[PDB]
Amino acid sequence: PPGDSVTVSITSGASENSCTVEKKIRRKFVGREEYLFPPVHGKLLKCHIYDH
Amino acid sequence: PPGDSVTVSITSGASENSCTVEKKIRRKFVGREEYLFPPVHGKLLKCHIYDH
Amino acid sequence: PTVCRVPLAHTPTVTKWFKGITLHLTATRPTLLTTRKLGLRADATAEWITGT
Amino acid sequence: SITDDFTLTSPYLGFCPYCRHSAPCFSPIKIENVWDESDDGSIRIQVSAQFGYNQAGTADVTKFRYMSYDHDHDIKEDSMEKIAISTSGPCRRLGHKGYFLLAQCPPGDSVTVSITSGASENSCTVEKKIRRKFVGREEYLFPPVHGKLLKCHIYDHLKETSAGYITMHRPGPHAYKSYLKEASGEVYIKPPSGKNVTYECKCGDYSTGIVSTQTKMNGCTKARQCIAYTRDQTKWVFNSPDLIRHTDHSVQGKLHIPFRLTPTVCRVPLAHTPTVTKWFKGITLHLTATRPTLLTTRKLGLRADATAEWITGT
Amino acid sequence: PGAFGDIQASSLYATDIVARTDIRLLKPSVKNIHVPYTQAVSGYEMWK
Amino acid sequence: KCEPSQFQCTNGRCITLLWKCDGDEDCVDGSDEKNCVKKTCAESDFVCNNGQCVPSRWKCDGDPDCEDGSDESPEQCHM
Amino acid sequence: KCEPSQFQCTNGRCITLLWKCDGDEDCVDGSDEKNCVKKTCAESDFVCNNGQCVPSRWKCDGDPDCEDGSDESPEQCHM
Amino acid sequence: KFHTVIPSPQVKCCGSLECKASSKADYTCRVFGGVYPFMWGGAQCFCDSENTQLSEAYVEFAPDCTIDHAVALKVHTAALKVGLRIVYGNTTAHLDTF
Ligand SMILES: [Ca+2]
Ligand SMILES: [Ca+2]
Ligand SMILES: [Ca+2]
Ligand SMILES: [Ca+2]
Numbered sequence: 001p002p003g004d005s006v007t008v009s010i011t012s013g014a015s016e017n018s019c020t021v022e023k024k025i026r027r028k029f030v031g032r033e034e035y036l037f038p039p040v041h042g043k044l045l046k047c048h049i050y051d052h
Numbered sequence: 053p054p055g056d057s058v059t060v061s062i063t064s065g066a067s068e069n070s071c072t073v074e075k076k077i078r079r080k081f082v083g084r085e086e087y088l089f090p091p092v093h094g095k096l097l098k099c100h101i102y103d104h
Numbered sequence: 105p106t107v108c109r110v111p112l113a114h115t116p117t118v119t120k121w122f123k124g125i126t127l128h129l130t131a132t133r134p135t136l137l138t139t140r141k142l143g144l145r146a147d148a149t150a151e152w153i154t155g156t
Numbered sequence: 157s158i159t160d161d162f163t164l165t166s167p168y169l170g171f172c173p174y175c176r177h178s179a180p181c182f183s184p185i186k187i188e189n190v191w192d193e194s195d196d197g198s199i200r201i202q203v204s205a206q207f208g209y210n211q212a213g214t215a216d217v218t219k220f221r222y223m224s225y226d227h228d229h230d231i232k233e234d235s236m237e238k239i240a241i242s243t244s245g246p247c248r249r250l251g252h253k254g255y256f257l258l259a260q261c262p263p264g265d266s267v268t269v270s271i272t273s274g275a276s277e278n279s280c281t282v283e284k285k286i287r288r289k290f291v292g293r294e295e296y297l298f299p300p301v302h303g304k305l306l307k308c309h310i311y312d313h314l315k316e317t318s319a320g321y322i323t324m325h326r327p328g329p330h331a332y333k334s335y336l337k338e339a340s341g342e343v344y345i346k347p348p349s350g351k352n353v354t355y356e357c358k359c360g361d362y363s364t365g366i367v368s369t370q371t372k373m374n375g376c377t378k379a380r381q382c383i384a385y386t387r388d389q390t391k392w393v394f395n396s397p398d399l400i401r402h403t404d405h406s407v408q409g410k411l412h413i414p415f416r417l418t419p420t421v422c423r424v425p426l427a428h429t430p431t432v433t434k435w436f437k438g439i440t441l442h443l444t445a446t447r448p449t450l451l452t453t454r455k456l457g458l459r460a461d462a463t464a465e466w467i468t469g470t
Numbered sequence: 471p472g473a474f475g476d477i478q479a480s481s482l483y484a485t486d487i488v489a490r491t492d493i494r495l496l497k498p499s500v501k502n503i504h505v506p507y508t509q510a511v512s513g514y515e516m517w518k
Numbered sequence: 519k520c521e522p523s524q525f526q527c528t529n530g531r532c533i534t535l536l537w538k539c540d541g542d543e544d545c546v547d548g549s550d551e552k553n554c555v556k557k558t559c560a561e562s563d564f565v566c567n568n569g570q571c572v573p574s575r576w577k578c579d580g581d582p583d584c585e586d587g588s589d590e591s592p593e594q595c596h597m
Numbered sequence: 598k599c600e601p602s603q604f605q606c607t608n609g610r611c612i613t614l615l616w617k618c619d620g621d622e623d624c625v626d627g628s629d630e631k632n633c634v635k636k637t638c639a640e641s642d643f644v645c646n647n648g649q650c651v652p653s654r655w656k657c658d659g660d661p662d663c664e665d666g667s668d669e670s671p672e673q674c675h676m
Numbered sequence: 677k678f679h680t681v682i683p684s685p686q687v688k689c690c691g692s693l694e695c696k697a698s699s700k701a702d703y704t705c706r707v708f709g710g711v712y713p714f715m716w717g718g719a720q721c722f723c724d725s726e727n728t729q730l731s732e733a734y735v736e737f738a739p740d741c742t743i744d745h746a747v748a749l750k751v752h753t754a755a756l757k758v759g760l761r762i763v764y765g766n767t768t769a770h771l772d773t774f
Contacts, residue, residue, distance in 0.1 A: 004297060022297050036056060036074050083110040084136035088266065088283050090109040092173050092180055093499055093506035096534060098523065099108035107523050107535060114508045115494060130472065130510055156472050156511055169716050171502060182502070182716040189679075193740040226562065227573070227717065305613055307602065309743050320739035328684065333718030334573050337583065348575065358690060358722045370581055380543060381722045397505050400713075400720055401684035417743045421602055421614055475748065477678045477701065477735060482742060487701040489678060489735045495706040498729065501542070503713040503720075505682050505731050514677045514746070542714070546724060 002027050054079045130156045158321055158410040162206065162254065163213030165324060165411070166231055166391035167223045170204040171398040174281035176270075184222040187282040188255070188396070190267050193417060195291050195308040198250060198260045200415055203269055203280075204396065207236065207252040208315075220252075225276070227332040228348050229389060238271050243286055253315040253414045255322075255394065263288050292424035293450040299423045308422035311415045319416035324392040324409040328400040335384035343376040345384050357382040444470045476513035525550065604629060679738040686730045687713060689721035693730040700734035707731075 003025050009018040029035055030047045055077050061070035081087055082099045113135050119126040129137065131154055140148045170186020188202040205222040209215060211233040220239065224232045241247040241257060243264030251258040257269070264286050270279040290296055291308045335353060337344035347353040347368055357363045359376035366387075376382055392408050393399065427449050433440040443451065448468045454460050477489035491513075496506040520532035527533065527545030537544045539554035559565045564574040567588040576583045578595030588594060599611035606612065606624030616623040618633035638644045643653040646667040655662050657674030667673060686693065695705040711729040713720055721727045759772045 020298070037072070082108045085111050085113060085131075086133045086135070087111050088133075089174050089178070089281070090180075091111045092171070092504060093496065094109050094111045095499075096107045096523070097110045098105065100105050101108075112496075112508075114510070117492070128472075132511070156516060171504070180500075191738075191740060193744055225716075227575070305602070305615075319742070325684065329720070330715065331717060331720055334575070339583075346576075346579065346581070349579075356689070356722060362690070380546075380548075380719065380724075383720065383722055395681075395683055397682040397684065398503060399684045400503060400715065401686045405684065405686070413739050417740050419743075474746075477737075479737070482737065482745065486699075487735070487737065489701040491678060491680075491702050491735055493680075493702055493704045493733050493735075495704060495731045495733060497708055498711055498713070501537070501544075501712075501714040503685060503687075503715055503729075505685055505733070507680075507682065507731070507733055509680060512677045542718070 001025075128156075129153055158318075158412055160412065161213075162209050162215075164392055164409065165206070165213070166327075166389075166393060167206045167221060168204050168393045168396060168399060169223050170280075170396060172280040172282075174266075174279075176277070176279040183278050183280050184225075184276065185269055185271060185278055185280045186396075186398070187267065187269060187280050188394075190282060190284045192284075192286060193309075194311045195289055195422060196260075196310045197289055198258060198311045199267070199286065200311060200413075201241065201257045201259065201267065201269060202255050203257060204255070204394070206254055207239070207257065208254070222276075227334045229330065229386065234271075234274060234276075238274050240270055240272055242268050242270070250313055251315045251415060254411060256414050258311055258313070258415045261286055290424075291422050294425050294427055294445075295447040295449070296425050297447075300425045303423050303425045305421045306424050307419060309417050309419050310422075312418045313415070315414045317414060317416035317418070318412040320413045321410040322413060323395045323407045324411060325395055325405055326402040326408060327389050327391065327393045328402045329385045330400070331383040331385040333379075336379040336382060338379035341377055343373050343379050343382050345371045345373060345382070348386075351386055352388065353384050353386050355382060355384045443467050471510040471513070472516065473513045474517040476510070677738050677741065677744070678735045680733060681736050682731075682733045685713075685732075687711065687721060688728050690723040690726040691728060693728045695730075698734070701736070703732070703734040705730065705732050 004022070005020050006023045006025065007018060007020045010016055027036075031045050056074070057072050058075045058077065059070060059072045062068055083097050114130045116130075117128040119128065127137075129135075134152045134154045136150070137153050138148065138150050140146045167184065169182050169184055170188070171180065172183040172186045173180050175181040175183055184205055186204040188204065190202075191200040192198075205220060207220040208217055209221055210219045211221050211231055213221075218236050219233050220236050221231050221233045224230045236252075239249075241249060241259040241261065243261045243266060245262050245264075247259045247261040249257065249259050261267070265283070266281050267284045267286065268279060268281040271277055288297075292306050335345055335347070335355075337346060343357070343359075345353070345355050345367060350368070352366055352368050354366045355364065355371070355373075357373065357376055359374075359381050361375070363374075373382070428444045430444075431442040433442065441451075443449075445468055448466045450464065451467050452462065452464045454462045471490050471492035476491055477487065479487040492510040494508050496508065498504050498506060520526055523535055524532040525535050525538050527547065527549045529546050529549075531545065533544055533550070538550045539556050541551070541556075543551050545551075557569075559571045562574055563571045564577055566572050566584040566586075568585050570584060572583060572589070577589045578591075579589070581590070583589045599605055603611040603613050604617050606626065607628045608625050610624070612623055612629065617629050618635055620630070620635075623629045636648065636650075638650045641653050642650045643656055645651055645663040645665070647663060647665050649663060651663065651668075656668045657670075658668070660669070662668045693707050695707060697703075698705075708729045708731070710725045711727045712724065713727070713729060755774065757772060757774045759770065762769050762771070
């Protein structure tokens with residue numbers, strides 16, 4: 001989700017630590033109409049996503 | 053609390069899923085004075101609430 | 105329908121001069137202040153006042 | 157004389173404006189004051205409960221004592237890991253002593269101290285504007301790795317420091333409706349087993365006495381016209397705004413306020429060095445800043461036209 | 471009230487503080503014990 | 519009479535509606551308590567055999583408390 | 598001298614107060630460390646019978662290491 | 677910055693309470709007619725309407741004011757003092773004078 005920092009942590013166990021770096025993460029969208037998540041019905045545009 | 057979406061989810065079990073719809077939920081106040089929560093001392097106004 | 109509880113703002117202090125009054129208002133959260141003359145025409149005003 | 161022997165004190169029941177169920181109610185975890193004057197974001201919270209002590213009052217870091225809901229006016233103890241502080245997200249707890257907690261918190265609009273589990277899983281919330289703070293003339297989000305050292309004040313994490321004192325007064329009367337019976341048409345008073353309890357009534361005439369057994373009582377028809385409370389409590393209690401004061405409200409002792417404000421050195425960022433373009437009777441500055449930074453100038457003559465702008469961007 | 475110097479004292483530990491913060495005490499309304507009150511903002515905070 | 523958001527006791531007083539059916543007696547004759555249908559009992563309030571809500575410590579203290587005296591019954595507390 | 602913000606070693610060099618009593622020898626003689634009363638030890642830092650903070654692996658390595666020689670004691674490490 | 681202090685209220689069942697002058701800063705006191713207050717445990721007084729409550733509120737110094745505090749000053753005529761590096765021949769001198 002959008003935020004102002006990125007954190008990686010080891011939740012439990014003996015080596016319980018954390019790390020944080022300043023970084024601006026903003027909501028992104030494709031096209032000319034803002035939205036919160038891909039709606040069910042609409043036209044298909046061209047985008048780029050990281051391959052899982 | 054105030055937010056931009058409403059989510060119902062089944063936390064644990066075999067059928068662990070979630071659902072989300074876009075809905076603007078904003079903080080509501082009664083009268084002519086903004087407040088965070090009903091204060092201890094004040095006058096009584098007329099308001100409508102859902103019955104528990 | 106039921107009754108809620110709403111805050112009562114800090115009572116203002118009036119400074120009186122010739123053909124005019126001055127209000128000294130304090131409000132931690134936004135508050136409404138409306139005025140209207142009692143003559144033939146009513147110069148109604150509305151303002152959300154915050155701070156001193 | 158400031159005393160540290162907590163065995164002479166006891167917690168009490170405040171009036172939290174916002175309990176767990178989003179309605180004002182009597183709670184053992186009432187927030188009294190919240191102070192935020194440190195430069196690193198930490199805050200000091202006063203709570204009607206007592207942390208870092210056992211039921212008997214002796215020192216014990218792992219346990220906190222609080223006032224039970226029972227009518228016998230009893231003090232209960234519990235393991236401390238049930239206690240958490242939060243404003244918008246979880247807060248990291250730093251220190252604790254007596255009525256006071258020291259926690260580091262993210263920005264938010266309210267301060268909440270809660271008991272997560274157990275029989276008494278309550279909460280308490282008070283409105284308070286907690287905002288991010290920084291030292292120096294350049295904004296940041298956490299202290300950077302490399303920079304110059306300024307002078308800053310932070311709350312001392314140690315619990316042996318002192319920043320003042322708070323008064324301690326005698327406990328007031330506390331009547332419980334459980335002591336009134338009202339069988340058929342007569343008000344009866346019953347002590348909680350082997351205790352001496354006093355009563356007052358105004359059933360036509362003012363009546364008052366001390367009893368330790370069942371009392372028929374005379375001339376009283378409604379339970380609402382009598383009160384009954386105990387007198388053998390002697391532990392002092394804070395000067396709370398939610399307690400009926402005793403007849404003699406004279407100060408009996410003082411308690412340290414831990415986590416005094418101390419001077420130390422913080423680290424602050426150094427902005428990107430500006431590039432100077434020189435022209436006739438004037439210079440042009442090429443500035444860059446990811447976060448707002450302050451740029452002030454002043455002439456060196458009689459007139460001192462002074463500028464002060466929060467440059468951001470490029 | 472509401473400006474700089476709303477509270478003054480000859481020194482930090484002096485016992486003769488004098489202030490004028492426009493304290494108003496209100497009539498209690500709720501059943502449980504309470505001391506409702508209202509006050510002007512901190513003049514020191516405003517000046518800061 | 520008073521505005522409908524305020525309930526009037528059978529004595530000549532009008533109080534706010536939040537005080538009705540709240541477990542506390544506010545009218546001088548207690549008209550705001552024995553009129554609603556609430557029947558809940560807290561954990562510390564033992565429910566007597568007659569249905570009346572009575573504090574738990576009242577039980578088997580040596581004197582009758584309930585209308586039928588269930589508190590003093592040897593069945594409930596064994597001596 | 599220097600400003601109070603920086604402690605001065607017994608050599609003529611001033612260092613920031615953040616390096617005072619941090620478990621690290623900062624001054625040329627280590628005077629910045631032998632003045633505070635810190636006595637905590639790490640999980641891997643075994644505490645000798647004399648209170649010295651020493652690594653756990655240093656224990657019973659075949660030669661005396663502590664002042665009192667508790668490291669080589671048969672009680673601590675049975676042969 | 678001030679820190680408001682609100683002492684524990686005093687209530688008398690069937691009686692009257694009177695304001696008394698105090699030397700504390702901005703000491704404000706009031707007396708209220710009929711209250712019948714409640715605490716955890718029910719009513720605290722037997723009189724139905726003759727209950728009197730007295731409220732106090734004065735102002736003290738905040739505990740953290742020992743560091744975050746301001747001082748007001750009145751400044752008279754300023755005096756000036758300088759240091760010099762007078763030299764002559766092959767000898768240099770340093771001195772301060774008003
Ligand atoms: Ca009622
Ligand atoms: Ca019984
Ligand atoms: Ca060091
Ligand atoms: Ca060894």
